[PDB]
């Protein structure tokens, strides 16, 4: 039978820091960044209000 | 230097290494 | 002969500190290390057996 | 409420390597440079603030 | 035989202009894959 | 319900051998060792006790 009840799709994650490479292609940079690494940034400096 | 390590085949040394950085 | 000390060295050192302090929280050690003349260590095993 | 800490006494002890004088007097001061400096760094150099 | 399979070596039915950035700045994309690579045997 | 005890602490090892190198470092490199066929360990004769 139905009792006409929905089902609530969900996800978990644990024990897992979400990382963001500061770089417009993310992948496999590390160090030597794309964006946040520009000789652009090292003459001024901003401030970061989230 | 070339005395310094035990080589296999008659050969002192052999082949050259590379460590990897942390960050990636 | 190379990479093989054919003379007496150590391998462990043991030494006590001279002071040690019972605190609230902490509980110092000041020691005198001193390595061989002609030794050498990788900072990986420097421990304090408790 | 229940445990109460008590340690007796703290000892050094180090791995050291029995070292060949034939490389290891070159090898000595073959760190001793201001070029030859190694640097350590870790795989997250993250900076935190709670 | 102009398919690839019954020729000699891989990197040299494409273009040599394209060769050249493909293991010093390739981190981006592990490409050894859109065009296939096939292998001598004895017969 | 609070008793008094000193432990006896004790390791177990099967399985494998107790193996030992034949060096002055004490380090099995390659299959022949450096005081395996050294100066004072490699025409002459010589007996060992325990």
Same mark, same amino acid.
């Given at each position: 039978?139905?009792?006409? =009840? ?5 996800? +978990?994650?644990?024990?897992? !820091? ?8 993310? %992948? =496999? ?5 794309? +964006?946040?690494?520009?000789? !652009? ?8 209000? %989230? | ?24 | ?50 | ?50 | ?43």
């Amino acid at each position: 039978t139905a009792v006409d =009840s929905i089902t609530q799709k969900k996800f +978990l994650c644990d024990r897992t !820091l979400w990382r963001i490479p500061f770089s417009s292609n993310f %992948m =496999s940079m590390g160090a030597l960044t794309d +964006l946040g690494q520009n000789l !652009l940034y090292a003459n001024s400096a901003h401030a970061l209000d %989230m | 230097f070339a005395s310094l390590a035990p080589r296999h085949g008659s050969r002192p040394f052999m082949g050259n290494w590379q460590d990897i950085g942390t960050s990636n | 002969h190379d990479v093989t000390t054919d003379r007496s060295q150590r391998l462990t050192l043991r030494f006590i500190p001279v002071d040690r302090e019972d605190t609230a929280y902490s509980y110092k050690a000041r020691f005198t290390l001193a390595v061989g003349d002609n030794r050498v260590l990788d900072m990986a095993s420097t421990y304090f057996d408790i | 409420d229940g445990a109460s800490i008590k340690f007796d006494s703290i000892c050094l002890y180090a791995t050291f390597f029995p070292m060949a004088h034939n490389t290891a007097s070159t090898l000595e001061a073959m760190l001793r440079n201001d070029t030859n400096d190694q640097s350590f760094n870790d795989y997250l150099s993250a900076a935190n603030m709670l | 035989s102009y398919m690839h399979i019954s020729g000699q070596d891989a990197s040299e039915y494409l273009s040599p202009g394209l060769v050249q950035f493909a293991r010093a700045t390739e981190t981006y994309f592990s490409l050894n894959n859109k065009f296939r690579n096939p292998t001598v045997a004895p017969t």
